[PDB]
Structure 1
Amino acid sequence: MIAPMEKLVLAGPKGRAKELLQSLQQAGVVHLETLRPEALSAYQLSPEERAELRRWEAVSAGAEHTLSLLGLEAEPARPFPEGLEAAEKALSPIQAHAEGLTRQKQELEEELALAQAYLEPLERLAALAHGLDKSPFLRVIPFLLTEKELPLVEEALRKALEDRYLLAHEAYAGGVAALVVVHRKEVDQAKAALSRAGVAELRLPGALGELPLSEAARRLKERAEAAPRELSEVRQHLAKLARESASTLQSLWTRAQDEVARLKALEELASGRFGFALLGYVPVKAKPKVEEALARHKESVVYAFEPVDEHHEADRIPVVLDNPPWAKPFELLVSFLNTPKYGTFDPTPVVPVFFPFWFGMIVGDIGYALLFYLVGRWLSGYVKRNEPLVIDLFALKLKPQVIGKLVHILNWMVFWTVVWGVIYGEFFGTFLEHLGVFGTPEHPGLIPILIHRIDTAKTANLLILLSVAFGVVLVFFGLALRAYLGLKHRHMAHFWEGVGYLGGLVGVLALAASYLGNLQAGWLQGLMYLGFGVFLLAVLMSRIWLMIPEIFTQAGHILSHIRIYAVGAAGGILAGLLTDVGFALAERLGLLGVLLGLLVAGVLHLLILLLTTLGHMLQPIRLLWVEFFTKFGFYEENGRPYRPFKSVR
């Protein structure tokens, strides 16, 4: 249900307002409100307070960056209550050590990569260059190049001197080390011509392509020998530093998040010229703890605890769910929808009443309900492990309270699922083929089942009538709720619209059942006449040209409930056909490969379940959200959210 969401107004001096801001941040049960306009100041606190807030925000940002560099995740925990400068001095040692480690390990890894990129080929080039390394008559253009286009480079070598220009590829032929040595200027022209034919002198980065090749090879060999143990020790030091400092970093980050939230909340105040006043919204069910915190203040200051505004424009007033403990898990599904109009009825209990019953009538496979209960047992074991439900495949880490609400909703739906599967007479699909635990007139093995589920000529008319009747009762409840909301909000347009929708729906249903159904339209002639007259009368009471299209849309929304019976019968017929074909090709074809054929049939049925049962469960909820929400509106400004101070801890 919609909560009261009582409004609270507080006032006093400035330092007491800062202490009460710390209190109402610790007692974060009231969403904020500006209320700046009438005879108030802006409460721009201080540029010194702004600088301290910038220091705390920089501390929190550096803590998040250091947690990211540490690889750990930022978890809210118990705060570290200390000064800002002391927390900065504590963090900056750890942040400096982490920055030095993250620079050094990345540099060692990049140095190992660049050393292994040209380790053996530069060694072979320095082995082949044993006569003119820095001899003052010849340069050295070495090219770790491609395959035997050495004649194409020998064309440029013959363009250079032929009795000079030692130019060959020695070994390590992945990059064939075509070193060339002729002269200074003639070798410059020869290297230009070889690059025109396709060649490149090995100009590597750092010092390996910036020093003499013997010293470059010695330094690269030293780096390749040292970088593995250095990277291992740096990873060990980083892991030990994370395991020894992440707790203090997370406590400091939680305290910094709390202080920065208090700093951001101090900006949204409204001063009174060495006085301060503010407005907020807290629940009337939470009024006791809020009043205890107000008495816990230094003054028990003046808290005008009025209620919210009435159904005429309660839009800045926040919204919150008022459901039972059994109805508490339906709030998670209603969280897919927006917040209410603060006077709009939350149908989330009727959602847990109807979508569980519709999902039970849809899902009537005992094997599927057994798989649901087994998955509930597995999720209950994971919730006994008490971790956040983290599916990196789904990339979703979820709260275990959400998992518990899902398990409770799964149990409350599986009750009706097993109930309607017994009503369908379906055990793991169709086990009545072999052992007739239900009773049919064709194959009586035990007592009868309510639904035949293979025979439908007696079942089609009754299933269609029940699926029509459930949607008609839901449409009547939605129109009555719309008229009641128009009456309670004094919105006579909405009340007359709901009344005309109900009258036109009654007249249209009477006319359809009279003309298209059976005979004897005498009791329904005046019914259809009065329904059309009431629809035209409330249309004149509206005069907004809300035409027959809206009535036909409501009629189609009521008629859409037969798709649930269609989908349930389709899933039952598909599971029965799969199990029957599997049992036929397993036992009726052989009676000895029954285990392998039953395994193949169960695998195909599980694949069909994973393909279709999610949509079968969703389309009842989809039709419920399409019908019950829109019949009550549920798209009117979405109200306001209950957004108090967090104090996440």
Structure 2
Amino acid sequence: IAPMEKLVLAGPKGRAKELLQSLQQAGVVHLETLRPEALSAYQLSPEERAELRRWEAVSAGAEHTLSLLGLEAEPARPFPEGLEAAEKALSPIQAHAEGLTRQKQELEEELALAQAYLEPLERLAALAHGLDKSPFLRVIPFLLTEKELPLVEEALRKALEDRYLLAHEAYAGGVAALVVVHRKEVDQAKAALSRAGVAELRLPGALGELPLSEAARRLKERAEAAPRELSEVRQHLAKLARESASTLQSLWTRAQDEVARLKALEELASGRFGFALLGYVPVKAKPKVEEALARHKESVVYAFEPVDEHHEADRIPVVLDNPPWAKPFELLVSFLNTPKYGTFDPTPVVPVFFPFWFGMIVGDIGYALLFYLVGRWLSGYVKRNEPLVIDLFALKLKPQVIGKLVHILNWMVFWTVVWGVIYGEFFGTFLEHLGVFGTPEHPGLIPILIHRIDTAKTANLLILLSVAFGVVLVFFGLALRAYLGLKHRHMAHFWEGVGYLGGLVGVLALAASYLGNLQAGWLQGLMYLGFGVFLLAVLMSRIWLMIPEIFTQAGHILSHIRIYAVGAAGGILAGLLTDVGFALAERLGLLGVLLGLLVAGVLHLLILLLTTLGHMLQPIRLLWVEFFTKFGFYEENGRPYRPFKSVR
């Protein structure tokens, strides 16, 4: 959690424009409007509005030109020049690419429409090569269905029977039923045939709009000409993209920067040839903000005023401000919303407990070695500095997120291998072959703290460990909520957290007294004081946070045994799979151990790919469901620290 103090500057109008360009260069501070009192709205100029619209149109045209070029919006260094010369440079390449794309789309559509009726038009023209455009006979040609020519010839028999040359010659993809008699009677018979179901070959463009032989010659010319034209169009388009993509990207960067400055000028406040700007900035950037203000025209008043108090901090931004050892969990912390800028940053407990619970979840050392191999693959991909692209997942990831994922995977796998040594499990049960764990049933090597196969000596202790971890997390969350309520001086939530802690303590004490063991003397006054503290905080609150809320908190505390449940389930599944594979390999033959071990590794990899996602997700989900919700973390979602971009 950062201090996030208030930062203000002032000056004249164009002086604020230059200082705003400088502050957008060193974009480490978010702004604020403060339009309300004793100033203008800073509608800058109609000329400034027109220039901003022009630069925005230049940026939109550059984006559309990159879209038509096929390239993506990759940021780079800007192109510092005037707006007119940049527009003149952009419009040439955009016009060339637009004409090339229009010609390519039209030629592809023309080639497709020519290929759709290529051979049938030729066959119909060869059949009708005597009366093509003679002024006595219209020839209704129809690309009609299969050999049911009497069904359409019923209308021809309804016409003059020994007249009206009507047949289908060849090209069985569509039967070229051509019927040629006259103009008027043939038009009536064509209406009757369309009533029986028929359609004249009237295509678009000119091939369905000209005489048959001329349209056939033009369609054959287009079919012979379209492919080399499309190939040369693709070649010229690729050459234009390869020759103009860097300039278009630099122009898009400079245009995005100018449009950002123009849109940021709208948030200013005018003072009738006077201007000022206010916002937030972190306390760790006060030297950077002072160095940015060193380039001011008259070293303008950099007012580094303090942030608001524990109350009334609503538009204040929010930042992580965590240790660099814990910097990798920032994406998992920021998967949810932001805190109340005075709420407890719970990111450290994530690295404190999610690795410790996750090692208890997965205790397979062979899965840890496979995770190390996959992390080495991801580390080589990040060292290659390419963007992580998964098209079926639509996942494009930067190298920073991949490196944070690799660091989190290493920090997970260390404690995972530690707990797998504690569980004594490597790739399932490899101890069936060589007994690396030492059991009293079969001593092969040094003894395991947990055999992880039987539960007669393990289940009670595992449930006790999970319950103790969950109770410690619930008590830490309740204490953090009470401390935050005492800090914010809101005694309702503080009394609520104190009463919830007392009710949980009394519930656990009375449960361990009655349903647990004997010796109900020491904890009797404890349970009585817990119930009394619950009733006293209920009287001090009168908020009707009833026994339903206490039972929900108790269930959230008791839900920590799901970690031991999932760990025992995965261990039982891996041990059963490895035992069946080792039995059917060695005990059944001792020679199909290659094929048996391959099938066992395939089944183990399938079970890992099926269950490891949920096994890793359940601990982080339990952490987000317990440590956040016990401490609140669902109030007003915070305000984001959005400084000036300079996207680069």
TM-score range (shorter-chain normalised) is: over 0.9
| SS class of match (1:450) | coil
* 1:132, distance to aligned residue in structure 2 (A): 1.0
CA deviation vs aligned residue, 1:553-612 (integer Å, no higher than 9, x gap):
111111111111111111111111111111112222221111111111211111111111
Task: Tell me the distance in 2 between the aligned counterparts of 1:179 and 1:62.
Answer: 51
CA deviation vs aligned residue, 1:193-215 (integer Å, no higher than 9, x gap):
22222222211111111111100
Task: Tell me the distance in 1 between the aligned counterparts of 2:545 and 2:171.
Answer: 84
Task: Tell me the distance in 2 between the aligned counterparts of 1:632 and 1:513.
Answer: 26
2:88 is the counterpart of 1:89: yes
Task: Tell me the distance in 2 between the aligned counterparts of 1:503 and 1:225.
Answer: 88
TM-score, scaled relative to structure 1: 0.98
| SS class of match (2:455) | coil
Q: Superposed, which structure 2 residues align to 1:265-414 within 5 Å?
A: 265-414=264-413
Q: Superposed, which structure 2 residues align to 1:56-455 within 5 Å?
A: 56-455=55-454
CA deviation vs aligned residue, 1:97-128 (integer Å, no higher than 9, x gap):
01100100011111111111111111111111
Task: Tell me the distance in 1 between the aligned counterparts of 2:637 and 2:173.
Answer: 67
Task: Tell me the distance in 1 between the aligned counterparts of 2:534 and 2:133.
Answer: 104
CA deviation vs aligned residue, 1:133-181 (integer Å, no higher than 9, x gap):
1222212111221111211222222222233211111111221112122
* 1:378, distance to aligned residue in structure 2 (A): 0.6
Query: Given that residues 319 and 340 in structure 1 are in contact (C-alpha distance below 8 angstroms), is that contact kept between their aligned partners in structure 2?
Result: yes
Task: Tell me the distance in 1 between the aligned counterparts of 2:157 and 2:241.
Answer: 62
Query: Given that residues 388 and 398 in structure 1 are in contact (C-alpha distance below 8 angstroms), is that contact kept between their aligned partners in structure 2?
Result: yes
* 1:341, distance to aligned residue in structure 2 (A): 1.0
CA deviation vs aligned residue, 1:441-485 (integer Å, no higher than 9, x gap):
111101101111111111111111111111111111111111111
Question: Which deviates further from its counterpart, 352-361 or 304-313?
Answer: 304-313
Query: Given that residues 439 and 448 in structure 2 are in contact (C-alpha distance below 8 angstroms), is that contact kept between their aligned partners in structure 1?
Result: yes
* 1:625, distance to aligned residue in structure 2 (A): 0.4
What is the match of residue 558 of structure 2?
Answer: 559
Query: Given that residues 499 and 538 in structure 1 are in contact (C-alpha distance below 8 angstroms), is that contact kept between their aligned partners in structure 2?
Result: yes
Query: Given that residues 388 and 395 in structure 2 are in contact (C-alpha distance below 8 angstroms), is that contact kept between their aligned partners in structure 1?
Result: yes
Question: Which deviates further from its counterpart, 407-416 or 164-173?
Answer: 164-173
Query: Given that residues 12 and 275 in structure 2 are in contact (C-alpha distance below 8 angstroms), is that contact kept between their aligned partners in structure 1?
Result: yes
| SS class of match (1:603) | helix
Task: Tell me the distance in 2 between the aligned counterparts of 1:83 and 1:420.
Answer: 63
Task: Tell me the distance in 2 between the aligned counterparts of 1:313 and 1:619.
Answer: 36
Task: Tell me the distance in 2 between the aligned counterparts of 1:169 and 1:60.
Answer: 58
Task: Tell me the distance in 2 between the aligned counterparts of 1:130 and 1:573.
Answer: 83
* 1:539, distance to aligned residue in structure 2 (A): 2.0
Query: Given that residues 11 and 276 in structure 1 are in contact (C-alpha distance below 8 angstroms), is that contact kept between their aligned partners in structure 2?
Result: yes
* 1:313, distance to aligned residue in structure 2 (A): 2.5
* 1:336, distance to aligned residue in structure 2 (A): 0.7
Query: Given that residues 340 and 638 in structure 2 are in contact (C-alpha distance below 8 angstroms), is that contact kept between their aligned partners in structure 1?
Result: yes
| SS class of match (2:431) | coil
2:37 is the counterpart of 1:38: yes
**Structure 1 unmatched runs, 5+:** none
Question: Which deviates further from its counterpart, 335-344 or 191-200?
Answer: 191-200
Task: Tell me the distance in 1 between the aligned counterparts of 2:545 and 2:139.
Answer: 90
Question: Which deviates further from its counterpart, 304-313 or 391-400?
Answer: 304-313
CA deviation vs aligned residue, 1:267-319 (integer Å, no higher than 9, x gap):
11111221112211000011110111012211221122112111112221110
* 1:190, distance to aligned residue in structure 2 (A): 2.1
CA deviation vs aligned residue, 1:509-555 (integer Å, no higher than 9, x gap):
21111111111111111111222222222222212222122222111
- Tell me the percent identity: 100
Question: Which deviates further from its counterpart, 532-541 or 168-177?
Answer: 532-541
* 1:36, distance to aligned residue in structure 2 (A): 1.6
CA deviation vs aligned residue, 1:350-380 (integer Å, no higher than 9, x gap):
1111001100111100111111111101101
Query: Given that residues 341 and 638 in structure 1 are in contact (C-alpha distance below 8 angstroms), is that contact kept between their aligned partners in structure 2?
Result: yes
Task: Tell me the distance in 2 between the aligned counterparts of 1:451 and 1:313.
Answer: 53
| SS class of match (1:191) | helix
* 1:38, distance to aligned residue in structure 2 (A): 2.0
| SS class of match (2:53) | helix
* 1:499, distance to aligned residue in structure 2 (A): 1.4
Task: Tell me the distance in 1 between the aligned counterparts of 2:278 and 2:630.
Answer: 34
Query: Given that residues 5 and 318 in structure 1 are in contact (C-alpha distance below 8 angstroms), is that contact kept between their aligned partners in structure 2?
Result: yes
Task: Tell me the distance in 2 between the aligned counterparts of 1:463 and 1:645.
Answer: 52
| SS class of match (1:436) | coil
Task: State the aligned residue count.
Answer: 648
Task: Tell me the distance in 2 between the aligned counterparts of 1:125 and 1:621.
Answer: 71
Query: Given that residues 157 and 190 in structure 1 are in contact (C-alpha distance below 8 angstroms), is that contact kept between their aligned partners in structure 2?
Result: yes
Task: Tell me the distance in 1 between the aligned counterparts of 2:498 and 2:131.
Answer: 104
Task: Tell me the distance in 2 between the aligned counterparts of 1:458 and 1:150.
Answer: 87
What is the match of residue 495 of structure 2?
Answer: 496
| SS class of match (1:174) | coil
Query: Given that residues 314 and 639 in structure 1 are in contact (C-alpha distance below 8 angstroms), is that contact kept between their aligned partners in structure 2?
Result: no
* 1:415, distance to aligned residue in structure 2 (A): 0.4
Task: Tell me the distance in 1 between the aligned counterparts of 2:191 and 2:538.
Answer: 91
Question: Which deviates further from its counterpart, 496-505 or 278-287?
Answer: 496-505
Task: Tell me the distance in 1 between the aligned counterparts of 2:32 and 2:272.
Answer: 19
Task: Tell me the distance in 2 between the aligned counterparts of 1:77 and 1:137.
Answer: 70
Query: Given that residues 514 and 524 in structure 1 are in contact (C-alpha distance below 8 angstroms), is that contact kept between their aligned partners in structure 2?
Result: yes
Task: Tell me the distance in 1 between the aligned counterparts of 2:572 and 2:262.
Answer: 62
Task: Tell me the distance in 2 between the aligned counterparts of 1:602 and 1:583.
Answer: 11
RMSD: 1.1
Task: Tell me the distance in 2 between the aligned counterparts of 1:189 and 1:546.
Answer: 85
**Structure 2 unmatched runs, 5+:** none
* 1:338, distance to aligned residue in structure 2 (A): 1.0
Task: Tell me the distance in 2 between the aligned counterparts of 1:646 and 1:563.
Answer: 44
Task: Tell me the distance in 2 between the aligned counterparts of 1:196 and 1:546.
Answer: 77
Query: Given that residues 27 and 646 in structure 2 are in contact (C-alpha distance below 8 angstroms), is that contact kept between their aligned partners in structure 1?
Result: yes
| SS class of match (2:635) | coil
| SS class of match (1:19) | helix
| SS class of match (2:541) | coil
Task: Tell me the distance in 1 between the aligned counterparts of 2:185 and 2:338.
Answer: 82
Query: Given that residues 584 and 596 in structure 2 are in contact (C-alpha distance below 8 angstroms), is that contact kept between their aligned partners in structure 1?
Result: yes
Question: Which deviates further from its counterpart, 242-251 or 171-180?
Answer: 171-180
CA deviation vs aligned residue, 1:6-47 (integer Å, no higher than 9, x gap):
111222211111111111111111111111222121111011
Query: Given that residues 201 and 208 in structure 2 are in contact (C-alpha distance below 8 angstroms), is that contact kept between their aligned partners in structure 1?
Result: yes
What is the match of residue 550 of structure 1?
Answer: 549
Task: Tell me the distance in 1 between the aligned counterparts of 2:200 and 2:321.
Answer: 77
Question: Which deviates further from its counterpart, 281-290 or 270-279?
Answer: 270-279
Task: Tell me the distance in 1 between the aligned counterparts of 2:59 and 2:37.
Answer: 36
What is the match of residue 591 of structure 2?
Answer: 592
Query: Given that residues 29 and 644 in structure 1 are in contact (C-alpha distance below 8 angstroms), is that contact kept between their aligned partners in structure 2?
Result: yes
Task: Tell me the distance in 2 between the aligned counterparts of 1:68 and 1:531.
Answer: 67
* 1:183, distance to aligned residue in structure 2 (A): 1.5
| SS class of match (1:641) | coil
Query: Given that residues 437 and 451 in structure 2 are in contact (C-alpha distance below 8 angstroms), is that contact kept between their aligned partners in structure 1?
Result: no
| SS class of match (1:329) | helix
Query: Given that residues 510 and 524 in structure 1 are in contact (C-alpha distance below 8 angstroms), is that contact kept between their aligned partners in structure 2?
Result: yes
* 1:340, distance to aligned residue in structure 2 (A): 1.3
